[PDB]
Design a protein around this nucleic acid. Structure first.
Ligand SMILES: [Mg+2]
Ligand SMILES: [Mg+2]
Ligand SMILES: [Mg+2]
Ligand SMILES: [Mg+2]
Ligand SMILES: [Mg+2]
Ligand SMILES: [Mg+2]
Ligand SMILES: [Mg+2]
Ligand SMILES: [Mg+2]
Ligand SMILES: [Mg+2]
Ligand SMILES: [Mg+2]
Ligand SMILES: [Mg+2]
Ligand SMILES: [Mg+2]
Ligand SMILES: [Mg+2]
Ligand SMILES: [Mg+2]
Ligand SMILES: [Mg+2]
Ligand SMILES: [Mg+2]
Ligand SMILES: [Mg+2]
Ligand SMILES: [Mg+2]
Ligand SMILES: [Mg+2]
Ligand SMILES: [Mg+2]
Lengths: 132, 195, 86, 144, 149, 65
RNA sequence: CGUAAAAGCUUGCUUGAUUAACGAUUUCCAGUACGAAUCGAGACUGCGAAAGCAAGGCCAGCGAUCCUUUGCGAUGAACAAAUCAUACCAGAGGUGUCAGAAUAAUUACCACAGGGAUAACUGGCUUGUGGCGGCCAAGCGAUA
RNA sequence: UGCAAGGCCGGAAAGAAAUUAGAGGCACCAAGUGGGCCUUCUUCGGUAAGCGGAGCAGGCGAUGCGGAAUGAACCGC
RNA sequence: UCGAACCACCUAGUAGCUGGUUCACAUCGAAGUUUCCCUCAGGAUAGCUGGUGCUAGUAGAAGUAUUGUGCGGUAAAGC
RNA sequence: GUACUUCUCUCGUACUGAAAGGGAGAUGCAAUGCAUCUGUGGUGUGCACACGUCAAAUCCGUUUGAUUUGCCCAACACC
RNA sequence: CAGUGUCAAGUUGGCAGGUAUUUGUCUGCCAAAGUUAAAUACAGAGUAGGAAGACCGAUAGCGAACAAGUAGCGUGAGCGA
């Protein structure tokens, strides 16, 4: 019988089994080792194509939002118009020399942009940009 | 020959189901000692080895300290420090900052429990190294370590029976506290009943 | 059964609780308005079989001191009057 | 492992352990958790006492981030000061400076007597916690 | 199974005995009970307020509780494969102070007081004599037996 | 079909276990309060005494050893 | 069953037929509800000079989840306010199939799964019915 | 004050209720079973039954062997 | 093929119902009962039973007697 | 496949309340203060204690004190 | 979201801020136009090329190891060795 078992709640009542009648709706990761090799092969092959450029662009520090994460820093996409203006670079010209640009961030605390404005002029120091 | 004596047979666990090759050495060590000695210790420390892994509950250094302080308060005050033997394994205790220089003999130690002993001033032993010091186990304080409060033992029960403060098997902790566990849902599991 | 209009209390006006307003916008009826809406059957059961003919009497001992209505509940009586002991 | 099975162990038993009178059927005691109030009510009322009801008010959009308050006790503070970081807690008379949220542990609960004097910086702190630390050579500091 | 009320099949059980009816004793009101003594839970009628269930009538057991006018008695009840120590709550009149130990209350009272008298005491007064042995018995009336019809 | 047959012999296989003695579950609880509220306060004192009696012991057993 | 200076009768004064912090228990029992009881505690009380008695009329007379509903005095989650809703709490509306689906037929045109767990059938069994017989005949006619 | 009472307690106590003393106590997990039948004793219903419903114990089921020629149940075992 | 055709599909539809379910030996070994169920061809829950045990256990042992000590209203009896 | 991995998450070390929320060391003085280690009693391995006991000899079976480990029962405190 | 009825406003704004309503504030955002790689799904055209396997081993593995969707069946949809 039953008895002193946890009420199951298994949630497998929607034809997920790829039987003879149903096409099945399961995602088995039998290809993730092929894909890890697949991506690192594109990655290492895209890197020698973009060379001498860095494969990854430059991303700023941003604060993870909620009270659970607000003390954890993170790399967000693009900087802002603000850091770029407070570091000289035109956000049209920053977005073409590897710097990633985000016209949506709002620089709510000066604290925030100060870490990133200075983070630009580190890059803008150790970047050659040899002309064409 | 009518008997009735059919169910009086107790399950004693003759051997160990462990496959650890370093405990089958301690077991052959403590069959020799437990058999060809008049030691009460060696008898007892042998059934505790062949015993299973869920039944050899770990004692924290806290438990070892306090009970070795309850021994060392009534001694000759210069006689000796008995050896705290536990046939489970010893775990560190971050609630005990200062630990005495006590000798301990466990099948295992945490990496933080071995350093806490050796930093304290004591030396943690083994059982091939305690068969050299009191093999009969004179001056050894044998210990189990609490196996109640274990989450397995507090699901044991029904939890819907009056006077059953057991925990229902429920992943969702906020699933079953409704009807049957409320005084205003036509009955409340009676928290007390004489048994 | 009879019952007195007045009961003295040391701790008083009797009304014989007869509520039943049956609000709209009650959470179980908003659901119902949503749940039995449109197609499908009468998407809920309904007490069809007969009933307990006699009904239990809630009795609201509203203190003549302003506030804090009490409720006592009597037994199941067919005829209930507050005649108050003629 | 399929050889480690009992219907592979009990070949030739003709029933694989399900009997001759009550034959092993398909779903025969309902299917699923069916009958929790009808015919398995004795199982549910007795191993699942609180199932089958309603309780409390609804919190519609529940977000576990704003309702996030992990807790550490006073006897577990030593879990955040390495012996080296506590080696400076020996010399110079410099109390340890513990900062909870960096290790998790928003709230600081007061359990036991604090082994080592320190100054914790926690978002939240209990009344008895706020008092054991400030009377053990220490100080709670509220952050965020 | 038409009727199984709290007082079923109990005509002769709660019925008072012949020519002894009416109010309970003044002894039964002047009894003295502690937590621990034994009591015969002999439910009498004519009080009809506090009688236990039928089952607990020939039953005796510890008093675990003495309220102002209700004695609480534990009673062993062999339910099916185990006995429950039931905890009944009755009034005092449904209760006797159970003799069931005078068998050795009064035994060891004089048995020790003479074992002491036999071990140390002051002196050893001779006690009850032997019971079963032989003997050259002298008869006092002969007889025979054949029939009586 | 009520039978009661085989039941008395089922109750005596694993035996009709005897009752627990009085020192088991002797919770003087749910009983008459003015007793247990006094058998409570006298337990508190008798515990302050049990703790105190061990305090001299160890301290007598120290100096007198 | 029980009761006789009452538990019945008459009168008096009354609401203890109330809140009960509900604590425990009994019966049903799985020692789970429920229902009804028992022993209590805290008030506040009534009746008594008092001890005491009373938390109905003993013991049958009753009802879960959800919903509705009233009483009773935290939330609606960017903040604030009032409504509105919900929540906790205690009750009521009720499930008589009374541990609680929301319910009419007919099938000989019928179909299926099975069942000798169960009828017609058949094998028995039942020995009283229905029909046959014995001794004894008030006497019939003591018997053709 | 001290009796008595509870929670205690130390000083002290031994037996001049038979037997087995075929070890007590819990705990966990899990089946199968939830159609029984016969029988002894007694006994409710029925004209009766190789009948229906019970109480007790024993059986059969789930079990042979031995013999009542023969028999799930009887007698031995 | 018709009281709803035929083909393919949903579909391996569901079945508390019927049939079957593949080696050996060893160690033990039952139940047809309790309560609840639109329940009475089924379940759930106890009991029975197995395995693993834990534990200081001639004891908190007993289908037994003795001893005291209660209880009862059937047989017989008596109208 | 193997090897490495900060980061994070996950389970849990803390529970509770419907919710706002809150949130468990012990002892002495107190009704918060100060030194700041089993929490109480009970049932309780092992060893050390002395205690004698046909005891080959003297090591162990007997046992009584000590601490009692686990466990259980009772009732403290605290959330 | 749809359908019908209704049908706006204008940055003194509009929508979103998971409980309805009104009154306020605050925060984000700017619908009713449009394009946009990659990471993601798929072995179907194996198209092109393949590589593998604790798989099956001819009653198995695809229905099909072979002149297999063939012979043969069905009025036909289809069935199918
Ligand atoms: Mg614990
Ligand atoms: Mg079955
Ligand atoms: Mg069956
Ligand atoms: Mg801040
Ligand atoms: Mg009266
Ligand atoms: Mg009942
Ligand atoms: Mg009740
Ligand atoms: Mg009544
Ligand atoms: Mg009265
Ligand atoms: Mg036989
Ligand atoms: Mg014959
Ligand atoms: Mg007679
Ligand atoms: Mg002790
Ligand atoms: Mg529209
Ligand atoms: Mg608008
Ligand atoms: Mg808005
Ligand atoms: Mg508005
Ligand atoms: Mg405005
Ligand atoms: Mg657009
Ligand atoms: Mg072939």
């Amino acid at each position: 019988p039953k008895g002193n078992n946890a009420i199951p709640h298994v949630h497998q009542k929607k034809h997920w089994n790829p039987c003879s009648s149903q096409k099945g709706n399961v995602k088995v990761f039998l290809n993730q080792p092929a894909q890890k090799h697949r991506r690192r092969r594109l990655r290492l092959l895209k890197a020698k194509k973009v060379f001498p450029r860095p494969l990854k662009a430059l991303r700023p520090q941003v604060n993870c939002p909620t009270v659970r994460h607000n003390m954890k820093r993170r790399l967000g996409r693009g900087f802002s118009p603000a850091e770029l203006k407070a570091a000289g670079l035109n956000p049209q010209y920053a977005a073409t020399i590897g710097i990633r640009v985000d016209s949506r961030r709002k620089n709510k605390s000066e604290e925030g942009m100060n870490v990133n404005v200075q983070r630009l002029k580190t890059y803008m120091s150790k970047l050659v940009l040899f002309p064409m | 020959d009518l008997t009735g004596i059919s169910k009086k047979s107790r399950v004693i666990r003759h051997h160990t189901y462990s496959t650890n090759p370093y405990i089958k050495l301690l077991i052959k060590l403590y069959k020799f000692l437990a058999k060809r000695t008049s030691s009460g210790f060696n008898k007892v420390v042998y059934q505790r080895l062949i015993k299973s892994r869920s039944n050899r509950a770990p004692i924290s250094l806290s438990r070892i300290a306090v009970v070795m302080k309850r021994k060392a308060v009534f001694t000759a005050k210069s006689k000796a420090a008995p050896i705290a033997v536990v046939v489970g394994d010893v775990l560190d205790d971050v609630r005990m900052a200062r630990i005495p220089a006590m000798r301990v003999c466990a099948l295992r130690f945490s990496k933080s429990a071995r350093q806490s002993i050796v930093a304290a001033g004591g030396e943690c032993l083994t059982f091939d190294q305690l068969a050299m010091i009191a093999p009969t186990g004179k001056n050894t304080y044998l210990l189990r370590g609490r196996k109640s409060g274990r989450e397995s033992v507090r699901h044991f029960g029904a939890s819907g029976v009056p006077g059953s403060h057991s925990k229902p098997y429920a992943t969702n902790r906020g699933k079953e506290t409704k009807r049957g566990r409320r005084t205003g849902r036509s009955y409340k599991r009676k928290a007390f009943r004489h048994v | 059964v009879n019952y007195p209009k007045k009961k003295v209390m040391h701790c008083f006006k009797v009304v014989q609780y007869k509520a039943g307003k049956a609000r709209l916008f009650a959470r179980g009826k908003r659901r119902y308005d949503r749940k039995q809406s449109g197609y499908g059957g009468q998407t809920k059961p309904v007490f069809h079989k007969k009933a307990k003919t006699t009904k239990k009497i809630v009795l609201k001992l509203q203190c003549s001191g302003c506030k804090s209505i009490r409720q006592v509940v009597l037994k199941r009586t067919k005829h209930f009057e507050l005649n108050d002991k003629k | 492992p399929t050889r480690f099975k009992k219907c592979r162990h009990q070949r030739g038993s003709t029933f694989c352990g399900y009997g001759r009178v009550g034959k092993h059927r398909k779903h025969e005691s309902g299917r699923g958790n069916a009958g929790g109030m009808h015919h398995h009510r004795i199982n549910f009322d007795k191993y699942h006492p609180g199932y089958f009801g309603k309780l409390g008010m609804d919190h519609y959009h529940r977000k576990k981030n704003p309702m996030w308050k992990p807790t550490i006790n006073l006897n577990n503070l030593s879990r955040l000061i390495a012996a080296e970081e506590a080696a400076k807690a020996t010399k110079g008379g410099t109390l340890p400076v513990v900062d909870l949220q960096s290790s998790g542990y928003a709230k600081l609960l007061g359990n036991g007597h604090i082994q080592v004097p320190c100054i914790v910086k926690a978002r939240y702190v209990s009344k008895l916690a706020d008092k054991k630390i400030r009377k053990a050579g220490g100080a709670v500091v509220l952050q965020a | 199974v038409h009727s199984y009320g709290y007082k079923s099949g109990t005509r002769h059980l709660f019925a008072k005995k012949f020519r002894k009816h009416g109010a309970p004793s003044v002894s039964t009101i002047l009894t003295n009970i502690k937590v621990g003594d034994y009591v015969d839970v002999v439910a009498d009628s004519a009080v009809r307020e506090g009688m236990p269930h039928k089952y607990y009538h020939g039953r005796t057991g510890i008093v675990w509780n003495v309220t102002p006018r209700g004695v609480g008695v534990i009673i062993n009840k062999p339910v099916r494969t185990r006995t429950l120590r039931k905890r009944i709550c009755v009034r005092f009149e449904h209760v006797r102070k159970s003799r069931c130990q005078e068998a050795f209350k009064a035994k060891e009272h004089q048995f020790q007081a003479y074992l002491a008298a036999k071990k140390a005491g002051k002196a050893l007064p001779p006690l009850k004599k032997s019971s079963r042995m032989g003997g050259i018995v002298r008869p006092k009336n002969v007889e025979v037996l054949a029939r009586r019809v | 079909n009520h039978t009661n047959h085989n039941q008395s012999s089922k109750n005596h296989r694993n035996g009709i276990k005897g009752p627990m003695p009085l020192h088991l579950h002797n919770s003087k609880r749910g009983s008459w309060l003015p007793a247990l509220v006094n058998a409570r306060r006298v337990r508190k004192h008798n515990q302050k005494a049990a703790l105190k009696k061990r305090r001299e012991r160890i301290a007598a057993f120290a100096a007198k050893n």
